């Protein structure tokens, strides 16, 4: 279906303990593939998937450069923003950035993005048209006026439309075995008891890739929400994802409540109800 | 493959 490549960077000042913490990660879809950590020994951009490890020396040096230079820009940016916002120097503060590019089932370019935040609130982001910026009032306006004048969007556009997409297309091929799979969920329903007069009914969905899934409950007709415990989709550890929604209901009415599981990689929507 | 060589600073 759709496909994305996103890089997430984070940077945290630490007045006392010298230079700040840096953590880059890169995703394709929802598979993590590279990471950098400043505090780690290697000071190398590190693979985190079997399909990128193929990549040569040209790649691994040049990615380590790009990321290092990026940490330095954040290092400065932390300083600049402590400025613009007038903050004390014993305070820890955070810069975050995420950029990346999506594509359709045809793998053609479909959109592009770049968004930036100081202390975990929206600072400045590049508009969908990739020509212009949107800035969160006070300080951001100064950043923008700088970025307008170095033609930063013109460079970004070239990355996001051209290069990002080429690389994304490379990754989807080179690692097709892992990125272009579907693992159907492994649905199952638990029956614990809230009481004598009630019965914790939980609808699982395990071992699935990709993470886009839909669980829904129904009481005879058309119930859909608010006896529906929808936990955030979470990772197992093994590259696949777990999710569940749960209903707790007047005991011996199990039968009239039904879970509805919808995944890419399901043939039809699977539907479960208390059985044994 | 990231944006490179480095972001424009703020």
């Amino acid at each position, epitope marked *: 279906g759709s496909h994305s490549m996103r890089y997430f960077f984070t940077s945290v000042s630490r007045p006392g303990r010298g230079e700040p913490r840096f953590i880059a990660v890169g995703y394709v879809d929802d598979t993590q593939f590279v990471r950098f950590d400043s505090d780690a020994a290697s000071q190398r951009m590190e693979p985190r998937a079997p399909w990128i490890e193929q990549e040569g020396p040209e790649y691994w*040096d040049g990615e380590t*450069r790009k990321v290092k230079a990026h940490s330095q820009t954040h290092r*400065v940016d932390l300083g600049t923003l402590r400025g613009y916002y007038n903050q004390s120097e014993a305070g820890s503060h955070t810069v975050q950035r995420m950029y990346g590019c999506d594509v359709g089932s045809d793998w053609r370019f479909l959109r592009g993005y770049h968004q930036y935040a100081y202390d975990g609130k929206d600072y400045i982001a590049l508009k969908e048209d990739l020509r212009s910026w949107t800035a969160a009032d006070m300080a951001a306006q100064t950043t923008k006026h700088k970025w307008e004048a170095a033609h930063v969007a013109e*460079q970004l556009r070239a990355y996001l439309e051209g290069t990002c997409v080429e690389w994304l297309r490379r990754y989807l091929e080179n690692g097709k075995e892992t990125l272009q799979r579907t693992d159907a969920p492994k649905t199952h329903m638990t029956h614990h008891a809230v009481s004598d007069h009630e019965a914790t009914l939980r609808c699982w969905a395990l071992s699935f890739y990709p993470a886009e899934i839909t669980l829904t409950w129904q009481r005879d007709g058309e119930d859909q929400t608010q006896d529906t415990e929808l936990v955030e989709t979470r990772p197992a550890g093994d590259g696949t994802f777990q999710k569940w929604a749960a209903v707790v209901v007047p005991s011996g009415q199990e039968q009239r409540y039904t879970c509805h599981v919808q995944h890419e990689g399901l043939p039809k929507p699977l539907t479960l109800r208390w059985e044994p | 493959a990231q944006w*490179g*060589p480095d972001p*424009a600073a703020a």
Partner: T-cell receptor
Amino acid sequence: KEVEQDPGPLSVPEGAIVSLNCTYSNSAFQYFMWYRQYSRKGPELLMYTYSSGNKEDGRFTAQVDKSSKYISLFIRDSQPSDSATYLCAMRGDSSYKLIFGSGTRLLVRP
Amino acid sequence: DAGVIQSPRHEVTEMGQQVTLRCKPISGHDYLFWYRQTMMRGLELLIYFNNNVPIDDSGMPEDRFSAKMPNASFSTLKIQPSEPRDSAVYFCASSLWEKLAKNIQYFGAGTRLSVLE
């Protein structure tokens, strides 16, 4: 990171048009430019060109054809002041480091 | 206003001897580049610093060469010992993001170094 370039000396008359060119082996490259270096001086940028497209600046035109992997500079109306070494630089995504050709020494005989 | 300044303009030295090359970049430029030029390999990068930390240093030879920016206004490139094959011109250069955008780097006139037998 290696780029072939005939070092001259290229000797042309005042009034001529000079073709300078490098060919290069790595296609990760993406920006292409020409620096000019006068005898005992630092090199200063002459002309740059984003990608396939040709930038023109009065008497200087500069080109990149990426399939052939061929960079070129065209000086019309040769002035003697154009006597200089001419060096094609170029780089990629990964670093600001310019990769330079050996250079071509242009000499225009007034 | 005056551009990149490099001391010395020429440095004739004997081999064995620590040569030390200096550069002060243009005020306001956070990128600083050490390039060498010989006749045999052409102009080449040695290293470049970005807000004083080294970024690309792939053209630094394996031993002998050292380079720092102890602050934003000065860099040494230090060869110890020298050898006759370090004879080269060694340029320094500085730039900004809005100028490296268009690949404008600004150069010094370089230290013609002859290391001798």
